[PDB]
Write a protein that binds this DNA or RNA. Structure first.
Lengths: 49, 146, 49, 159, 98, 48, 63, 341, 71, 22
RNA sequence: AGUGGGUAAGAGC
């Protein structure tokens, strides 16, 4: 049947409403990592151990 | 205090506007390409074409009857002894990286790394240690002669 | 914390409700050579986001 | 794809003669590219560094096609044709990608640049739906080259 | 590239035929040339690192043959390892130490 | 209507009580089965 | 097997050496084959030939 | 730690304990104090400093938040015209406020939150409170306090300013925030705990521990492009040292049978090229792909190992038709560029 | 045996790339039946792989010995 | 600013469902 | 409205 719902616009406006990545990361420890930018980064769901 | 409202950095909006600008540029390029691409009797008569083919065949039968160097090297002048010659190769750089194509010798790199390690072992503007470390002698070529 | 998309470290919960973001939570700070500057999220003069 | 192949067969030096192929068309093979943006950047760099490499244009266009941006693929192929008029593979890819009339005009431009190759002539004959148009393009081909058996064998169906 | 060439031929008997590149040697002669070349590499690494050949261990010699190096411009990461948490002192130029 | 092409009828919709009960039960079993469970798993189940 | 193991326990028998073949070479003597590969090849081939010749001499004595 | 916990969050307690293990807060204070000592010792004559002393403090002074004591003391040569106390970013200073011969310096570290991370206001408030505090012990009434928010990496100085101190302290503190060993350790531990990385993925990377795994009956191809674009340089005692380009050789060596393939490139290729490096990279990738296409399927390689890291991108581009051919980078430098010697 | 078991239970390249999630760049959820499942960098832009990550056949699913006997 | 989720019964009836979506 | 659900364990002086 295909995908009957799109959350792209909802998540777009949810990021927009929260002030964007800059404000959201201000709420976090991101600036405490001294990462020059938020672009070339990735997460890791589980640790090696 | 009183702040100033900054522009919101929205990655979704960035991707969407990038796609929209790409689509607009593609449409403009398509229009410009069609501007050039849109400028291009015997077509139906078989006997006329046969006669023309025969006449072209007989017509063909009747007719038959170094100064290019201006780059730089990652070494000092005194690093090269006068009485010896060496081979200078390119330095491994990423293809997407757009730095200057420096020229390098492997043996001298090994020697420089060894002497750097020896100097570091022996050691053990303002605020030099955090500048010269966390923040490469070279000379440029001219017509193949330096 | 809840309504941040999971890539930005949040939980990415979908909200079928009415949740207001206090204006005091839409301000961030950035340090440049001249000093530390402060930014709000929106020029709009409306209720809390 | 490539254009240079090398055959494999009391000395130390064993040279291999270069072999060229008239066509080099790998199928679409979609889904093999993981990083679309990185691959696009690398192929753009190849196009900049080796503008006269038809496989570069072909690969970039097919990557754009499998991505879904079927207009930038057409633009890239047109740029390649304006840059590599000698290789007919780019023109054949252009005919494959562009719609009917646009691809017919591209094949005509190929004939202008390369009136000796016959694959573009056969492709144009396939595009031209009119029997009169098929006759016209085939007779233009034979005027440019009348000693091709693989093209003359279509004259019996041309009547 | 100079002493290595000398080690390649231990005697004038070993002749490199034009058919191939490296000289043809007996198995034991190959062993001796290999150990001599290993000694060459270790001695030259010691020359550029002021380290004795015997100072290197088996794994270290393997690493050197492969091409491993050790360097540390910022060793202060040693900080990973009454109390001596502030007693460390600073020496100034105006002071006799500096 | 497919003939008059007029607004002959008005259809008012509502979520059935059984569906609401099922949704509440699903949320309840999501929550009560969360003693040892990551927050992301709970949020993903709720989102689904 | 228990007899051999307890003989090794009491020191009457040296501890068994790993059985090395060509494939097993870089796994058993990997850290040392880079020191002098030809000597390592000679040693492992000597061990393989020793096992093979022990088998052959056992067969011949049994003949 | 100097971190204040509002309500016990056992997970956050464990995380912050692990981040600041091995007395990291004290070591960060030590590193910052000594960096300031060195930066002042460098500029000891231009600032009319007689000498600089690293004031002794308690082992747990870094945690002393209720009270504070001087950490760095500056001795004036003859006299210092201490100005009115002001924030670090306040360039304007009323220089002639009080003369003195000492300039104490206090260093504070805090773990800021969302609502409380404005380090300028925090620095000013702490300076005023500590100066007016009876429990706080300081040598002179003239000094400066520098506050660092590690949670947001925000540094600011408030207090008195002897002449020429503001620009030097601004540059020095910008440098220390940009680079600092203790701060680098803090960042690394935080990154490890949060488990995010700055785009350094793990790919097949041939090292000295998997070197033994190379020695298998599979088909392996060592591709090298070090000797593609090269010149010969010789130094003339009479004139100038000069160069001359020579031909290049791409190595497609095969350890299984020793079949070493040389791609010999004449110097005429680099005639009208303004970027020789990436052109050589793409030429090498093209030749490698062509060679694999030439060989039959049975003899085609399955692992391509490159000594240089520059071939990781181009080869994957030109090997886009061969997905079962994994490409391995090599951290260890196999001396294959010397085979042309 | 230890080598074989380590190969069987070890982390594969595609599995290693699966649990890497790109920061900032949001991805649309391609699994309607469950929003909690994503491929991470696998198939996502910026994954650092120009080519597609192949399947480690050492992790192939196969039946037990007794199941083979019964079959 | 409490952080609690408010019920949108009797709320935002000036908006449809097809709005804010392309 | 509200108390809590917020004790680091350890070594002898």
């Amino acid at each position: 049947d295909g995908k009957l719902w799109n959350l792209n616009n909802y998540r777009t406006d949810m990021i927009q409403a929260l002030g964007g990545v800059e404000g959201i990361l201000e709420h976090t420890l991101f600036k405490g990592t001294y990462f020059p930018t938020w672009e070339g980064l990735f997460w890791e769901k589980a640790s090696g151990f | 205090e009183e702040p100033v409202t900054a522009d919101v950095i929205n990655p979704m909006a960035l991707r969407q506007r990038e796609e929209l600008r790409e689509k607009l540029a593609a449409a403009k390029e398509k229009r410009l390409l069609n501007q050039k691409l849109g400028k291009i009797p015997w077509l139906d008569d078989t006997a006329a074409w046969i006669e023309r083919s025969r006449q072209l065949q007989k017509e063909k039968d009747l007719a038959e009857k170094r100064d290019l160097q201006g780059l730089t090297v990652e070494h000092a002048i005194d690093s090269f002894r006068e009485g010896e010659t060496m081979i200078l190769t390119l330095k491994d750089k990423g293809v997407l990286q757009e730095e200057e194509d420096v020229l390098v010798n492997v043996n001298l790199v090994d020697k420089e790394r060894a002497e750097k390690n020896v100097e570091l072992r022996k050691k053990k503007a303002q605020q030099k240690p955090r500048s010269i470390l966390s923040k490469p002698h070279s000379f440029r070529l001219e017509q193949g002669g330096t | 914390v809840f309504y941040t998309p999971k890539e930005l470290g949040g939980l990415g919960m979908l909200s079928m409700g009415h949740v207001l973001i206090p204006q005091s939570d839409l301000r961030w700070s950035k340090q440049t050579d001249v000093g530390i500057t402060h930014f709000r999220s929106g020029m709009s003069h409306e209720e809390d986001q | 794809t490539l254009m240079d192949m090398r055959l494999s067969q009391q000395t130390v030096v064993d040279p291999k003669g270069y072999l060229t192929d008239l066509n080099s068309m790998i199928p679409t093979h979609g889904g093999d590219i993981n990083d679309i943006k990185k691959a696009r950047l690398l192929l753009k760099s190849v196009r900049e560094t080796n503008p006269h490499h038809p496989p570069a244009w072909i690969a970039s266009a097919r990557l754009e096609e499998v991505t879904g941006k079927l207009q930038v693929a057409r633009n890239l192929i047109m740029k390649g044709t304006e840059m590599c008029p000698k290789s007919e593979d780019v023109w054949l890819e252009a005919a494959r990608l562009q719609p009917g009339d646009t691809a017919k005009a591209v094949v005509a431009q190929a004939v202008r640049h390369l009136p000796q190759s016959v694959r573009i002539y056969i492709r144009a004959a396939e595009l031209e739906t009119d029997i009169r148009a098929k006759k016209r393009v085939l007779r233009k081909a034979l005027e440019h080259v009348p000693n091709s058996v693989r093209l003359w064998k279509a004259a019996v169906e041309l009547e | 590239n100079d002493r290595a060439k000398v080690i390649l031929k231990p005697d004038k008997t070993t002749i490199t035929e034009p058919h191939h590149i490296w000289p043809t040697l007996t198995d034991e002669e190959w062993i001796k040339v290999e150990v001599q070349l290993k000694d060459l590499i270790l001695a030259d690494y010691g020359k550029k690192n002021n380290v004795n050949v015997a100072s290197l261990t088996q794994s270290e010699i393997r690493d050197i043959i492969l091409g491993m190096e050790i360097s540390a411009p910022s060793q202060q990461r040693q900080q990973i390892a009454t109390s001596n948490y502030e007693t460390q002192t600073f020496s100034s130029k105006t002071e006799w130490r500096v | 209507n497919e003939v008059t092409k007029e607004r002959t009828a008005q259809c008012f919709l509502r979520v059935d009580d059984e569906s609401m009960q099922r949704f509440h039960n699903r949320v309840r079993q999501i929550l009560m089965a969360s003693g040892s469970t990551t927050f992301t798993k709970i949020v993903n189940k709720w989102n689904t | 097997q228990k007899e051999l193991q307890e003989k090794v326990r009491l020191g009457l028998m040296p501890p068994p050496e790993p059985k090395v073949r060509i494939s097993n070479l870089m796994r058993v003597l990997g850290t040392e084959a880079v020191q002098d590969p030809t000597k390592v090849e000679a040693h492992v081939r000597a061990q393989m030939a020793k096992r093979q010749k022990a088998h052959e001499e056992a067969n011949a004595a049994r003949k | 730690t100097g971190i204040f916990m509002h309500g016990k969050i056992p997970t956050l307690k464990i995380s912050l304990i692990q981040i600041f293990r091995a007395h990291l807060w004290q070591k960060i204070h030590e590193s910052i104090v000594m960096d300031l000592c060195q930066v002042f010792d460098q500029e000891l004559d231009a600032l009319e400093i007689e000498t600089v002393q690293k004031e002794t403090i308690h082992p747990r002074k870094s945690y002393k938040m209720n009270s504070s004591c001087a950490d760095i003391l500056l001795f004036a040569s003859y006299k210092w015209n201490v100005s009115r106390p002001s924030l670090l970013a306040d360039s304007k200073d009323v220089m002639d406020s009080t003369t003195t011969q000492k300039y104490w310096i206090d260093i504070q570290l805090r773990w800021g939150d969302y609502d409380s991370h404005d380090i300028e206001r925090y620095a000013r408030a702490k300076f005023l409170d500590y100066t007016t505090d009876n429990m706080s012990i300081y040598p002179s009434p003239t000094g400066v306090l520098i506050a660092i928010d590690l949670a947001y990496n925000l540094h600011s100085a408030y207090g008195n300013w002897f002449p020429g101190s503001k620009p030097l302290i601004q540059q020095a503190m910008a440098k220390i925030m940009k680079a600092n060993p203790a701060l680098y350790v803090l960042r690394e531990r935080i990154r490890k705990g949060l488990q995010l990385y700055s785009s350094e993925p793990t790919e097949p990377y041939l090292s000295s521990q998997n070197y033994g795994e190379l020695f298998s009956n599979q088909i392996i191809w060592f591709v090298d492009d070090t000797n593609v674009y090269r010149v010969t340089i010789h130094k003339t005692f009479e004139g100038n040292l000069t160069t001359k380009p020579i031909n290049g050789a791409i190595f497609i060596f095969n350890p299984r049978t020793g079949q070493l393939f040389l791609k010999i490139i004449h110097t005429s290729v680099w005639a009208g090229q303004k970027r020789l490096g990436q052109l050589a990279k793409w030429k090498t990738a093209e030749e490698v792909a062509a060679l694999i296409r030439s060989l039959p399927v049975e003899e085609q390689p399955k692992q391509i190992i490159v000594t240089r890291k520059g071939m990781l991108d181009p080869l994957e581009v030109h090997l886009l038709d061969f997905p079962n051919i994994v490409i391995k980078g090599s951290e260890l430098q196999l001396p294959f560029q010397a085979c042309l010697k | 045996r230890y080598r074989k078991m380590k190969e069987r239970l070890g982390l594969t390249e595609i599995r290693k790339q699966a649990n890497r999630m790109s920061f900032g760049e949001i991805e649309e959820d391609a699994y309607q039946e469950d929003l909690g499942f994503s491929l991470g960098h696998l198939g996502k832009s910026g994954s650092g792989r120009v080519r597609q990550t192949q399947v480690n056949e050492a992790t192939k699913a196969r039946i037990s010995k007794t199941l083979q006997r019964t079959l | 600013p409490t952080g609690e989720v408010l019920s949108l019964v009797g709320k935002l009836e000036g908006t449809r469902m097809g709005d804010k979506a392309q």
